[PDB]
């Protein structure tokens, strides 16, 4: 099923999460090809992951560096596991903050329990050129994922 | 996924190249909406696009001439010949430096003291007049123009 090209962290046909550089949001993707490119500083060869997005074939094949690819998110935190300072993957909608949106990394800043509900607030990390959003109320506190590493 | 508006060349969410009306060069874009506008005769299609890397410019209305399938194929040197209309990287303000992607009519090519050189007429569409006898500095990155 999975084919090891012999380098890089992901197999051909492996299902992964891929980050869109403009948005900062993570999307379900699949490795289609893995290539190498010279480092700029004479260091180790840099790995390029060629991915396709599972629900967005219109995007074609996109070439990404390691920072923008990781194993597919699969584990959700229990409430007691959430603590300020953790970097976690959350759902958030920057345009309509009360609604479902995209999947972003966030630094948890604060959690509390009110008389009505459990609340989590976090610093949302956006795109490479995009600033962070502070004190974002994460509306889906039972859908906060652990970020996987290779 | 793509969505068919029922007319025109491009689907909703389709990724394309689209001209900057405020510059004349071509930019990665995506179809947002497709509509028709009254002409007096045949209704004309309006493609509403957003530019991938310029969200701040929002959605812009373009006619078909200012939208085309995204560039994907580079020419080999041996393929370049005077008269061809191709897409090149050029900077009108600092002509030796990288700029943006303009259509160009190839006028001359030659090898000078081992350096491949290409000269051509830079086209701006209707964003401005053409720029004649421009040296194209990036001769290994000259692209085929796609059609619908």
């Amino acid at each position: 099923s999975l084919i090891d090209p012999g380098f890089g962290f992901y197999k051909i046909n492996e299902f992964v999460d891929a980050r869109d550089l403009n948005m900062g949001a993570w999307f379900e993707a699949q490795i289609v090809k893995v290539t190498k490119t010279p480092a700029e500083d004479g260091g180790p060869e840099e790995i390029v992951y060629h991915v396709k997005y599972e629900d967005y074939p219109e995007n074609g094949v996109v070439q990404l560096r390691g920072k923008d690819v990781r194993p597919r998110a699969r584990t959700v935190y229990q409430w007691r596991q959430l603590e300020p300072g953790m970097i976690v993957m959350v759902n958030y909608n920057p345009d309509d903050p009360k609604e479902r949106g995209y999947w972003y990394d966030a630094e948890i800043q604060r959690k509390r329990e009110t008389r009505t509900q459990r609340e989590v607030f976090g610093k949302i990390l956006l795109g490479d050129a995009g600033d962070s959003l502070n004190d974002c109320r994460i509306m889906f506190v039972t859908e906060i994922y652990k970020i996987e590493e290779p | 996924s793509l969505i068919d508006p029922g007319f025109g060349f491009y689907k909703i969410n389709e990724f394309v190249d689209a001209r900057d009306l405020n510059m004349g060069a071509w930019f990665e874009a995506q179809i947002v909406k497709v509509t028709k506008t009254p002409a007096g005769g045949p209704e004309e299609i309006v493609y509403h696009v957003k530019y991938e890397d310029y969200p701040e410019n929002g959605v812009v209305q373009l006619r078909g001439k200012d939208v085309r399938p995204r560039a994907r194929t580079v020419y080999q040197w041996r393929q370049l010949e005077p008269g061809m209309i191709v897409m090149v990287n050029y900077n009108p303000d600092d002509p030796k430096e990288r700029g943006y992607w303009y259509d160009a009519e190839i006028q001359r090519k030659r090898e000078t003291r081992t350096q491949r050189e290409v000269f051509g007429k830079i086209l701006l569409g209707d964003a401005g007049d053409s720029l004649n006898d421009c040296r194209i500095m990036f001769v290994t990155e000259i692209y085929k123009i796609e059609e619908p």
Binding site: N22, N59, N91, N93 | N89, E141, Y143
Partner: peptide, 17 residues
Amino acid sequence: KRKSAGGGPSRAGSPRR
């Protein structure tokens, strides 16, 4: 499968970029 809203990623492949 994650529940999502909104559209897809903003960038598509572009060989020149």
